[PDB]
Amino acid sequence: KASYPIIRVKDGEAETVLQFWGTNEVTYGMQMRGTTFDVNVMSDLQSTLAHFVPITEATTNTKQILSPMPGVIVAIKVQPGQMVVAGEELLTLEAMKMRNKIHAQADGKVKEVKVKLGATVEDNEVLVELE
Amino acid sequence: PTAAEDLRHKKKRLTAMERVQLFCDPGTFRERDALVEHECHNFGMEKRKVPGDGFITGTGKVFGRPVFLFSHDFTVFGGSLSRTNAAKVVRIMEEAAKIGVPVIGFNDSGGARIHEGVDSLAGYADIFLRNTLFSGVIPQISVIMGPCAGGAVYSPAITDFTFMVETSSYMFVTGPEVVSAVGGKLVTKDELGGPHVHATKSGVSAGTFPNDIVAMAQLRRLYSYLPLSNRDPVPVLPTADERYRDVSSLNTVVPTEVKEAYDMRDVIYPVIDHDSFFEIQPQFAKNIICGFARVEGRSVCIIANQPKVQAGVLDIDSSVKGARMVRFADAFNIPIITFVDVPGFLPGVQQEYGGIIRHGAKLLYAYAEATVPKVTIITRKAYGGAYDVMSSKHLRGDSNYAWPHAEIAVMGAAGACKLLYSKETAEQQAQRIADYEKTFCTPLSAARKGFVDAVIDPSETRMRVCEDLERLARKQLQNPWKKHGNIPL
Amino acid sequence: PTAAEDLRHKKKRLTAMERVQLFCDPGTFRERDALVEHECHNFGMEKRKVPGDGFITGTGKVFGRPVFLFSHDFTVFGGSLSRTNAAKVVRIMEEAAKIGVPVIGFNDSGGARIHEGVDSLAGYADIFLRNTLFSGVIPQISVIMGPCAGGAVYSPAITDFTFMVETSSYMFVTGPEVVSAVGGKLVTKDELGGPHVHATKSGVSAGTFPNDIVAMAQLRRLYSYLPLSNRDPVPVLPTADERYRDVSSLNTVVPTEVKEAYDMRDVIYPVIDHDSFFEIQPQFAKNIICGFARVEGRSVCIIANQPKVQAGVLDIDSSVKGARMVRFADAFNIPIITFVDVPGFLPGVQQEYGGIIRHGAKLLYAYAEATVPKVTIITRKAYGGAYDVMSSKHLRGDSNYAWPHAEIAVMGAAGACKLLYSKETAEQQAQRIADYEKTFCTPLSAARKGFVDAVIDPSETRMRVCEDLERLARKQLQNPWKKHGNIPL
Ligand SMILES: O=CCCCC[C@@H]1SC[C@@H]2NC(=O)N[C@@H]21
Ligand SMILES: O=CCCCC[C@@H]1SC[C@@H]2NC(=O)N[C@@H]21
């Protein structure tokens, strides 16, 4: 069914079930045996032209993380100078009656000095420094 | 045979003809004019005539529906315009004005052609006038694949949507040489007018793509949404999705605490059909979301706040973004669906020093002037003038709905308690703010006054939206006679 | 009998009724509604009912021509709006929509009335919708005599012109208490939204007056210019001045050096009739002048650059100012006269970081969309896209004129010489820049192409303008059918 997950395919006797995650019209996100892949489905022109396309490399920066917006820090989660893993919440600012929660996108460890509780300073300061 | 394009591809770049071939259907492009020369006769230009004269204009066909397009050529004279280049574009736009067909242009010009004198200015003026006259008649989309400098930048600006390519494109009015000459600062071309700058800082570019191939692939998808002309109806496509699909996950999206945040996409995605959202300006003014989507196989317009970013507070940039989206959607008879969650306007001196009064009025003007069917859903809160601006029932709204835990009040409980008791005995906070929030920060009063049609379970939103949007298919409303409005610029 | 107004005058302030009496004719005001109560029945408001309910609405008559007006009252409840106050204003605006009459309002409200709940929001929404619908049908003028805070600020914004009183008026969206609460900065009310701030920084206020008496006296003079409605013709008044008055002082205004500055008013004043200029926004974006004036007894619109300030360079603020003026002038069929002297656009990073591309397109859109008769005079220079924007002949201009020492070129001589000779032998400056400026920085080439009708002596400008404006009295031009445009916001 269009835009749905389950996809039942049966060649001869063999039967398989795959899943359809999403796409950007050149790359298809399909699941095979409980694993995500990205298959490219392109015609003759797209195939012959995709060779002549720049492939830039994104910035790989392991450095200090700053608070996007002003606020107040009410709760902290991580400890100064210990291990940090991707997807871990680090602290929570509260602004105009709203607690956000900036986390650690991706890294192994940190070296820094924690901003103490109730420090209504923010203004894009260095709350946690990753080194 | 791959002649004369090896020099181009060696620089990791594509050609105009290749871009045109990628955009349209496999074999449905008919180039209109191909043997035209510049006839300049100045500054040693009497030689080196070119057959195509740096432009490729044709008709093409996308998804079985007609289109018109033109593409600049960087190899020939740097893509400069002339008295002769602009004639082809003018002819294409005039033909696409007679017939109800849109126009899409891939800009690559390096600037004006100096060897023609003021004829380049003449051509620019003609193109500007055609864009001005035909805006609101046929949709216009522009993509910038390479450099775009000088006064040629203005014609993409008048167009409805402008997209940018990441690595090898930029746009600005004046070059960095003049900036160094007058101010004395050394800034590179990318630092001045790169795609990121216009994606985040200036708000001109409506999107950014990583490659030309992806740009074409998604431009086709965007084109699948638009109506063909001003008088043609909104397209409807077949779809296996149905209004009876169960959405009970909406009962839990809103947290029971009033100070916790949530993602509005968790409310947007269930209501619309699967994998049918095309966000517009995703990296600019993130506190508001705008884009296109389909509901039961017909394209609609989506405008919702987001408490994830800055508590979902209206601002200057958000106001401009929403105003432009609403104006375009209404110009071509596209239904509008809005989700409301706003505590007010962003407070700060910089805001008044930047003219919040002008900018915030644009969204209100766009919402009040609109005559397309509107549907509004109030999830959690709506305070002060923000409630009025975000498509309130009094602005000729068709149907308005609220969720059982909503709040519609003049302002927060603290300010109301302060103003209602000047020098009342101390500790008044505890036994007054709670009571006022209990009694008047609830949708019961607004429902008593008649400002919301009904209070609904969050699981019935898809059913209600499909029903209302099906019933409202044939509304005919007209404004008083005017030559045109006077919007607060 | 001077009862109950002694408390008001003691604070060096006037009353609403006194302001109304000062505005209209001596005995031609007929108050419409005077015995109306709030019927609230909440928070101990069942008592202290007021007969007028804080508003004075009537009809009046100015210079023998009808008008409609309303005035807030600060003594009664602080001027707060309600479900009942807004009804009178809605009735007045609806009546002034049926009949071709304008509306003028003197705002003094302290904010919304909390004791009514969401009914104040309902009234605000109704007033906003009426302003949105009737903008471009009848002219709307607003004057702010006292405090104006909260969401009530938006209705003056949609109105065509907003004026301010110096000592005792201010306007902003959010009070300084909230600013202190969130940001922590202590700013006074005047430092936040005083008349000077909106006169110079935000660009919202169209003027400032020293006293209420002077405000009324000059508001009458402004009203003498406007047409009564959308369909009524431009007013023409008797005048002893004649087109045959000698103006030979224009032969010497332009200095013979290209780097010396002059005042454009020395060119503006001789052409128009004596003592008939009403500048709009005099203290904001001084590099451009906009206002109203009379030519042979009929009101026209004036838009001219000024090389006195910043070399007469177009900018963001100037673009917004000119765009709003042109849009208003065209909406009501008022002729436009422009004087051109521009070297280009202002170069700087802040400009691109602030969106020059969006703002500079607004003036071009306003000039191209307009259908009223246009007259353009190029005094000294016009370069690049600035020449295109400032009402060039290709944008359906009626008549264009130039002065004998004008210059119309693609860009300055230095840049052209640089681009036309990449690595040409050194010292090329002396024998190339002079030659190029001599050969192509002159109106002869632009006249050869046909972009200026004729090259005239500066002493004939009044004669030519009067002749053309008399002949063009009955032009009928129409744009293609649209629900409305899509201007770059
Ligand atoms: O209570 C003190 C600060 C309350 C601010 C509440 C939000 S912040 C921005 C917006 N402006 C307001 O007046 N209220 C909201
Ligand atoms: O020659 C170097 C600086 C020339 C600037 C000339 C004026 S300044 C602003 C405007 N932008 C230009 O490119 N030219 C004018």
Domain edges within chain C: 5-224, 249-472
Whether C142 contacts C164, CB under 8 Å = no
B380-410 in b/e burial notation, b at 16+ Cβ within 10 A? bbbbbbbbbbbbbbbbbbbbbbbbebbbbbb
Rounded Cα gap, residues C135 and C332, in angstroms: 11
Domains C5-224 and C249-472 share a fold: yes
- Residue nearest atom 2 of ligand 2, based on CA coordinates: B181
Q: Is C44 on the interface with B (CB under 8 A)?
A: no
Q: Work out the burial of residue A26: count CB atoms within 10 Å of its CB; fewer than 13 is exposed, 13-18 middle, 19 or more buried.
A: middle
- What are the b/e assignments for B217-247, b being 16+ CB within 10 Å? bbbbbbbbbbbbbbeeebbeeebebeeeeeb
Taking the C-alpha atoms of residue B276 and residue B279, their distance in angstroms, rounded to an integer, is 10
What are the structure tokens assigned to C200, written together? 């110079």
* CA-nearest residue, atom 9 of ligand 2: C346
What's chain B's Rg over C-alpha atoms?
26
Tracing tokens 């049609």 back to the chain, one arrives at: B453
Residue C107 forms beta bridges with which residues? C144
> Is the CB of residue C120 less than 8 Å from the CB of residue B410?
yes
For residue C318, give the nearest of C365, C285, C282, C360 by alpha carbon: C285
Q: Residues A28, A41: contact at Cβ < 8 Å?
A: yes
Check pocket membership of C433 for ligand 2, CB cut-off 6 A.
Answer: no
Give how far Cα C433 sits from Cα of C344, C414, C430, C440, C451, Å.
Answer: 19, 6, 6, 11, 24
Q: Which of chain C's residues have a Cβ under 8 Å away from the Cβ of A70?
A: 183
Enter the tokens of residue C313.
């360079």
CA distances for B384 relative to B415, C122, C127, angstroms: 12, 11, 15
Contact yes or no for C327 and B387 at CB 8 A: no
Ligand 2: distance of its center to the CA of B151 in Å?
14
Is the Cβ atom of C181 under 6 angstroms away from ligand 1? yes
- Residue C26 to chain B, least CA–CA distance (Å): 33
**Does domain B5-224 bear CATH number 3.30.70.20?**
no
Domain at C249-472: CATH code: 3.90.226.10
Residue among C52, C150, C194, C322 flagged as catalytic: C150
Resolution value, angstrom units: 10.3
Question: Which are the contacts of C68, defined by CB distance < 8 A and separation ≥ 6?
Answer: C57, C58, C59, C60, C92, C93, C95, C96, C101, C102, C103, C104
Cα radius of gyration (chain A): 23
Any idea which residues of B carry the catalytic annotation? 150-151, 385-386
**Residue B287 is which amino acid?**
N
Rounded alpha-carbon distances, angstroms, from residue B95 to A60, B143, B161, C77: 50, 21, 21, 62
Hey, are the CB atoms on B310 and A4 less than 8 Å from each other?
Answer: no
- What six digits make up the tokens of C488? 């770059």
Distance, CA of B175 to CA of C345 (rounded, Å): 11
C318 CA to chain A: closest CA distance, Å?
32
Residue of A nearest to B273 (CA): A3
Least Cα separation, residue C189 to chain A (angstroms): 22
- Span between the terminal Cα atoms of chain A, in Å: 48
Q: Say which ligand is closest to the CA of B413.
A: 1
What's at C65, amino acid-wise? R
Rounded to 5°, the CA angle C324-C328-C330 comes to: 120
Neighbors of chain A by Cβ distance (3+ pairs < 8 Å): B, C
